Amino acid sequence: ITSGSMGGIYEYILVIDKAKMESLGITSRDITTCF
Amino acid sequence: LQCYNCPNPTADCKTAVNCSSDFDACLITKAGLQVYNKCWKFEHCNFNDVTTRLRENELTYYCCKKDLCNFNEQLEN
């Protein structure tokens, strides 16, 4: 070391990343025949 | 109902069983090779429920009347 600083450092980092993707497709054909 | 039952894909479900409750429909379902037959419940013909329980997404089905109606070839094609 040629130069510096005496002291303290406090570093706190929080990262939260959430992603949620939902895609629901439907097709139906439903039929009756009764007597 | 007294249906053919095959909860697992069976291309010719011949497994007739004496679930012999009288008044109620059976299920037939064809999902290509994924063909299923059940001692189903009457008062039903909901595609979403069939897809749920049988875990199938392209299936074709009939809630055929009363007893022994549900042998595997009743669905053509």
Question: For chain B, how big is the Rg over CA atoms in Å?
Answer: 11
- Chosen for mutation from A24, A27, A29, A30 (greatest number of chain B CBs closer than 10 Å) is A30
**CB of B3 within 8 A of CB of B66?**
no
Hey, what are B15's tokens? 């497994």
Looking at residue B73, its amino acid is: E
Which of B15, B49, B63 has its CA nearest to residue B5?
B15
The answer to whether A26 contacts chain B (CB < 8 Å) is yes
Identity of the amino acid at B69: C
Q: Which long-range contacts (CB under 8 A, 24 or more apart) does B47-53 make?
A: B47/A28, B47/A30, B48/A26, B48/A28
HSE, side-chain direction, 13 A CA sphere, residue B38: 18
CB B72 within 8 A of CB B12: yes
Technique of determination: cryo-EM
B38/B20 Cα distance (integer angstroms) = 12
Resolution (A): 3.0
